[PDB]
Design a binder for this molecule. Structure first.
Ligand code: NAG
Ligand code: NAG
Lengths: 48, 38
């Protein structure tokens, strides 16, 4: 019925403890923002 | 000597708030971490 809810942070996972790496990540647009909302919708549907 | 290394940046931050037309008060949800910042 329920699947294990996993919220993966794409800011920390992709670039560990690095602002300069995250500065290059912002050039990719919503790839971080969109995938984080995709896993967010999964955790919400598992609750529903 | 032997020193264990535990990475920093514990947990995420989730904002819990009612609607805009209700109130502007918010409740911050710290995930999987003890009260620290406050
Ligand atoms: C808030 O809700 C009340 C009651 O429905 C309505 O009269 C009012 O226009 C709403 N105000 C805003 C800012 O949405
Ligand atoms: C937060 O405090 C509780 C108190 O029992 C403790 O069990 C828990 O381990 C603390 N946070 C973490 C992730 O260790």
């Amino acid at each position: 019925v329920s699947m294990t809810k996993t919220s993966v942070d794409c800011t920390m996972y992709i670039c560990g403890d690095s602002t300069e790496c995250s500065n290059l990540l912002l050039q990719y647009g919503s790839f971080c923002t969109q995938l984080n909302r995709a896993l967010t919708g999964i955790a919400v549907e598992q609750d529903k | 000597e032997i020193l264990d290394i535990t990475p920093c940046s514990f947990g995420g931050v989730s904002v819990i708030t009612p609607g805009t037309n209700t109130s502007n008060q918010v409740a911050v949800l710290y995930q999987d971490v003890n009260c620290t910042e406050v």
